[PDB]
Amino acid sequence: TAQCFLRVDDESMQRFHNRVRQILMASGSTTFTKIVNKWNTALIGLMTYFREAVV
């Protein structure tokens, strides 16, 4: 019948921007393991929620 072409909305995009900016501002003492863990959490927040639209 149809083809429901998807696309990530600007709201989740801005949320990811804010997450990346907060991580970048988390400096001074943060161990790199914690940083990689936080980024993996952010990415599996973005990915695995919408997958067809992330591409």
- The residue (of 33 and 48) whose beta carbon lies closer to other proteins is 33
Q: Which is nearer to other proteins, 3 or 29 (CB)?
A: 29
Pick 1 or 28: Cβ nearer other proteins: 28
Longest dimension (CA), the chain: 56
Region of 30 on the Ramachandran plot (φ > 0 left; ψ -120 to 50 alpha; else beta): beta
> Residues 2 to 41: which contact other proteins by CB under 8 A?
27-29
Please report which helix (H) or strand (E) contains residue 3, including its range: none
Give the footprint of other proteins on this chain (CB under 8 A): 27-29
